[model samples]
Target: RNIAEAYFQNMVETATPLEQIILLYDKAIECLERAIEIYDQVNELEKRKEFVENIDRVYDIISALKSFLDHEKGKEIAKNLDTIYTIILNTLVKVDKTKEELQKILEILKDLREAWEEVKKKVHHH
Candidate 1:
């Protein structure tokens, strides 16, 4: 039924853990941008509720990311990811969620993804 889900399932089954991490980041980054777009465009079109569901998906994405953490090893990097993710979560759950903070979250995710991209390029052992 869901073709994209099937594609993702296939790719995820094929990729290494590091590769999967970047894929997760890419998906999160994509969702955040989409949410921001929906926020802006949908407001011009209609109801706040539908627009807000876009933001809700970000929370679900965060939960998935959090689930990955306990599975993560490495001392400093993983800890730092935890710290930054907490800050992102705080920004996410703030009283007034703004397009600005969504951008901020996107910025962090992009920066984090960039680092992993570099790591992915250099480490070919897997």
Candidate 2:
């Protein structure tokens, strides 16, 4: 555990800002995928609890992403992302754990992740 923590700390210390944001997106998507995978296991109450925890994890990541938004520098894009993040949170609150609903959310997250990857590539090329 200590070694893993140290490695991650070094990774974060060396990462570009865009890379950090991409990492957060990766983690958020991972948690959502994990939640979907285990969703059918065990009792309904347990499933709900796990789902809430996973959603909360995703929410925290989005909150971090939103907090880093710069109104002065980012302008309209930041505002749009803020609005989208709020919508994601609201949707999460009403999620029914159905496969279709989870797949929809997963698709959204995957798209965002892909967008960030493209942005990272563009930034690196410049």
Candidate 3:
């Protein structure tokens, strides 16, 4: 566990700013996916606790990313992202182990992650 923590810390410390953002998105999606699995094992108390904590972690990541938006240069785009993030947070809060809702959230996060991947490619290429 300590080794894994050190590895992650190294990655974050060495990553480009854009890469760090991508890492956060990747982690958020992973947490959400884990939450879905835990939802399926709802009878397991420990899994349920992990699921709740995972949801909160996702929210925290989303909030952190949203906070990084540049409202000065990308006002409209930033506003749209803020709105989408708000919707995601609300859906997460009201999910109640609903597979459909979780799937919807997954789809949104996956799409955004793909978009960022493209951005990273473009930025790196140029």
Candidate 4:
């Protein structure tokens, strides 16, 4: 097997579920950050291609994350996160091409990740 895939395989396989969640959050945050940057300054059409790609990446992530939520076991947290995900998805659907919107969504993503970081800490403290 290739070293790269093997490394990623164990990375995903070895982490706690919260770690996985944060990993995805970090990925989405990265994509959104890059898209915002490109939107702010990039003029090249080819580079512009990646701007759309990252937006789509962020879109796919939120929708996918929402689908993964567990209402039964996650309880209130799941419900709240699901509703929040809905807002992000709605923004993407209606006005998916604005720097201001990306900035807003990015802030929300960062806030949620930080909150989860706190939860991850407390949950593992036992």
Candidate 5:
């Protein structure tokens, strides 16, 4: 989670709007990968499944944002919605799966919140 947080912070602070979105997509993928590895290490099938699903959701967000950035119509609006969707999705996953390991999800959500805030600021700037 700390690694993911650092990655998110670097991406959010250094990247431009479009580049930030791409970096975020990449970071989300990396975090989900790590989550899956952790789940596997713990031999938790359910957690692994959830992590895979989360990765799928991240992919969806990335695809949607990529499409939006490729054109002008609803570009900013779509990008904003992408961040919002990710927040809700992450919240749901954390609440549902991290019943025992709540701290894990909580930390992930903290990083996510920071990332989301950066997205909002970038959107507002544009």
Candidate 6:
């Protein structure tokens, strides 16, 4: 799963900045959707709980970005993106404080970093 995630991260890094945000939004949706699917497939308690929580987080990020993008432009996305990043970052800190939960958080961070790289690539192209 980690390796698969890293590959996805690279995809984000190679995307254009605009594509980065859009694609990240898409990818986050994918992650959440997959979580939902997997939870349905399995019977584990802890994993199910965490996966559901991740889905919620992903939805929040997607909605936040979507509203910002629809109403705002350019640097405004950057501001909103920064806030989104911080939320993820703080969750990371929490993950660290609770070492057992680090893997899941790491996966999300991998995705977020790729999203950042994707945006950078797009910005560079233009």
Compared with the true structure, all predictions reach lDDT values of 0.65, 0.69, 0.73, 0.74, 0.51, 0.51
**Candidate 3: residue 34 Cα off by (Å):** 0.4
lDDT of 6: 0.51
For candidate 5, list the clashing residue pairs, or say none. none
Clashes of each: 0, 0, 0, 0, 0, 3
Q: How much lDDT does candidate 5 score?
A: 0.51
The TM-score, computed over Cα atoms with residue i paired to residue i, of candidate 1 is 0.71
Better of 4 and 6 by lDDT: 4
Candidate 2, superposed: residue stretches over 4 Å from native: 1-15, 42-48, 95-99
lDDT tens readout by residue for model 2, 24-97: 98999998887788777737888878877987898798778767766555555666777777777776677454
In angstroms, the error of model 3 at 100 is 1.1
Q: Which residue ranges in model 6 land beyond 4 Å of their true spot?
A: 1-16, 41-43, 72-126
Q: Which candidate tops lDDT?
A: 4
Candidate 3 lDDT, 1-126, residue by residue in tens: 111121123233233776777799899999999988777876789887998899899989988877776655554666677788888888877855487788788989998878767765755565
lDDT ranking from best candidate downward: 4, 3, 2, 1, 6, 5
> After superposition, which runs of candidate 1 have C-alpha atoms over 4 Å from their true positions?
1-15, 41-50, 70-73
Summing lDDT over every window of 10 consecutive residues in candidate 3, give the lowest-scoring window: 1-10
lDDT of 5 by residue, 71-93 (tens): 23344544555465555465545
**CA shift at 37, candidate 1, in angstroms?**
1.5
Instruction: Residues 1-126, candidate 1: write the lDDT tens digits.
Output: 211221133233244776777787788788788777776666555635656665667676766676566423334544556677778878777867788888888988898778767655655543
Q: List where candidate 4 sits over 4 angstroms from the true fold.
A: 1-15, 41-43
Per-residue lDDT value at 100 in model 1: 88
lDDT of 6 by residue, 38-116 (tens): 6544458877677767666665765555444432323444455556555554553342234334446446556665665
